[PDB]
Amino acid sequence: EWALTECAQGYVTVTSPYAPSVNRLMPYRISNAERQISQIIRIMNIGNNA
């Protein structure tokens, strides 16, 4: 919710529960290096093509 609030520049409010949870698994966080590698690969695809 912090990320979503930040990315919307405060125009959207979202909420999260505040209580003992049951250990959900949400694998979405990766290092910047992987993002840069994927970005470079993606650039090389569109290389010189409109």
Partner: protein, 50 residues
């Protein structure tokens, strides 16, 4: 096209009664229910892994 961009620069109007913090709160709200970004993150991870 230069003509089109000039037309855009010359003929812009706002809704008759605009309040930005309400307009954006109303417009942006649906678009942060999209979970495509996280999927892209997982795809990016697999790319470097491969």
């Amino acid at each position: 096209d230069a003509r089109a961009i000039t037309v855009a620069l010359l003929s812009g109007k706002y809704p008759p009664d605009l309040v930005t913090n309400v307009w954006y709160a109303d417009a942006i709200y649906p678009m942060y229910a999209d979970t495509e970004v996280f999927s892209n993150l997982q795809r990016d991870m697999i790319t470097c892994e491969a």
